[PDB]
Amino acid sequence: ASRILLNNGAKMPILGLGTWKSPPGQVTEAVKVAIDVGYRHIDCAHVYQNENEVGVAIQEKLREQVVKREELFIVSKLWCTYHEKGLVKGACQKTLSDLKLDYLDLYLIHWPTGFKPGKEFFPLDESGNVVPSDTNILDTWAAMEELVDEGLVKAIGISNFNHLQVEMILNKPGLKYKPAVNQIECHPYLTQEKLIQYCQSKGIVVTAYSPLGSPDRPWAKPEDPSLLEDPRIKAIAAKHNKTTAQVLIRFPMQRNLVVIPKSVTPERIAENFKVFDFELSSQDMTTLLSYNRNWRVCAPLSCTSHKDYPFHEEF
Numbered sequence: 001a002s003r004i005l006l007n008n009g010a011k012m013p014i015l016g017l018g019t020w021k022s023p024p025g026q027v028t029e030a031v032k033v034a035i036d037v038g039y040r041h042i043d044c045a046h047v048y049q050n051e052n053e054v055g056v057a058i059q060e061k062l063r064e065q066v067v068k069r070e071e072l073f074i075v076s077k078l079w080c081t082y083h084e085k086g087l088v089k090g091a092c093q094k095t096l097s098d099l100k101l102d103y104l105d106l107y108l109i110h111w112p113t114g115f116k117p118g119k120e121f122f123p124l125d126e127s128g129n130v131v132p133s134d135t136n137i138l139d140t141w142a143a144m145e146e147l148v149d150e151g152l153v154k155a156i157g158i159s160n161f162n163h164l165q166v167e168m169i170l171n172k173p174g175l176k177y178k179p180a181v182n183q184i185e186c187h188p189y190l191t192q193e194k195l196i197q198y199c200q201s202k203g204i205v206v207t208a209y210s211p212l213g214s215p216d217r218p219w220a221k222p223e224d225p226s227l228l229e230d231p232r233i234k235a236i237a238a239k240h241n242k243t244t245a246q247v248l249i250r251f252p253m254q255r256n257l258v259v260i261p262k263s264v265t266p267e268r269i270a271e272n273f274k275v276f277d278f279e280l281s282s283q284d285m286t287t288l289l290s291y292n293r294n295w296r297v298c299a300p301l302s303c304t305s306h307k308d309y310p311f312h313e314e315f
C-alpha cells in the first residue's frame, strides 16, 4: 500500500520528495509538479535554506484546490544549533512560518549532535572542528514532546540515531511520546540491516535518505561509488524495463521502508513516482542487499569527535 501506519494513528506516504540541495530558485516548481503527479509527502529542513520556497508551492496548490492540507504529509527537522530546550519551539515555529503551515505532520531531531548555538549552521573552531553544545538527547527529546502537546506537530521522531541512541529515548524515565520514525541513510551500498531490524522491532518506522546515493552531495569525490551508474543495477532495471533510479526507489519500499528521493527536474520527479507498477523479485532483492559496503554519503570527519557522534557504533 501507499501509506504506512505510525505510532500516533496517522498514515505516512511511503514515497516522498526530498529537498536538500534543491535551490530556492527551482524548488517551488519542483514541489508544484511533484504534487501534480501524486506526491503527498515532502521532506524538508530549516538547514536546507529553502523552506520558504517549498511553502510557496504548497500554498499555491492549496489555493488552486489541487490538494487539501489533510492529504499532505510535511516533515521538517530541528537543526543541530537549536538543541537547547529554550530554542526548540522557536526553531519549530520558524519552520512553520516559512512553510506557511499551522502544523507539521512529523518533526525530527535532524542529528543527535547539538552544535554551538548561533547564526552559523556549522560552527567550527580555528582548526575546523565542529563546536558542540552542552545539550543531550534526552532533554532535546523532552522539548520535542512539548511541541506535540502544544499542537505544533502531530508526531516526532529522530534522524541519524544509532540503536543505542534510540534506546536512550525508549528507556527514558517519564517518556511521553516514543519516536515515530528514524530517518537514516540507506541504499544498496549501505543497507542498514541491523538498525532496520532494531527499529522495526521497536515499532519505529524507518525512512531511507539518499536512496540514489546523492550524486549531488557537495563532497563527492570522482572515485566514489556511484549507485546510479552501477552496471549491475542498470541490468536489474533493464530486465524490468525501468530506470536505475526506479529500481533504487522501489528497493526500500519492499523492505517496509519510507523513501525520499530528491529531484528538481520535472521529468525525473515524474519518473521517480512511477514505482507502483512493478515488483522486484526475491533474487533482485537479495542481489541488491549483497552490494552493501557499509558506505556513507553522510559521515563527515569534522563531527567524529562529538560525544554523540552516531557512527562509531556498529549500528
Ligand SMILES: NC(=O)c1ccc[n+]([C@@H]2O[C@H](COP(=O)([O-])OP(=O)(O)OC[C@H]3O[C@@H](n4cnc5c(N)ncnc54)[C@H](OP(=O)(O)O)[C@@H]3O)[C@@H](O)[C@H]2O)c1
Pocket (backbone or CB within 6 Å): 017, 018, 019, 020, 021, 043, 044, 110, 159, 160, 183, 184, 208, 209, 210, 211, 212, 213, 214, 215, 216, 228, 243, 245, 246, 260, 261, 262, 263, 264, 265, 268, 269, 271, 272, 298
Ligand atoms: N536526515 C538527514 O540527515 C538527511 C541527509 C541527506 C538527505 N536527507 C533527505 O533525503 C533526500 C534524498 O537524499 P539526497 O538529496 O541526499 O539524494 P538522492 O535523492 O539520493 O539523489 C538526488 C540526486 O539524484 C538526482 N536524481 C533524482 N532523480 C533522478 C533520476 N530519476 N535519474 C538520475 N538522477 C536523478 C538528483 O538530480 P536533480 O535534482 O538535478 O534532478 C540529485 O542530484 C534529501 O533531499 C533530504 O530530503 C536527509
Ligand SMILES: O=C(O)Cn1ccc(=O)n(Cc2nc3cc(Cl)ccc3s2)c1=O
Pocket (backbone or CB within 6 Å): 020, 045, 047, 080, 110, 111, 113, 298, 299, 300, 303, 306, 309, 310
Ligand atoms: O543534514 C542534512 O539533511 C543534509 N546535509 C547537509 C549538509 C551536510 O554537511 N550534511 C552532512 C552532515 N553530516 C553530519 C554528521 C553529524 Cl554527526 C552532524 C551533522 C551532519 S551534517 C548533510 O547531511
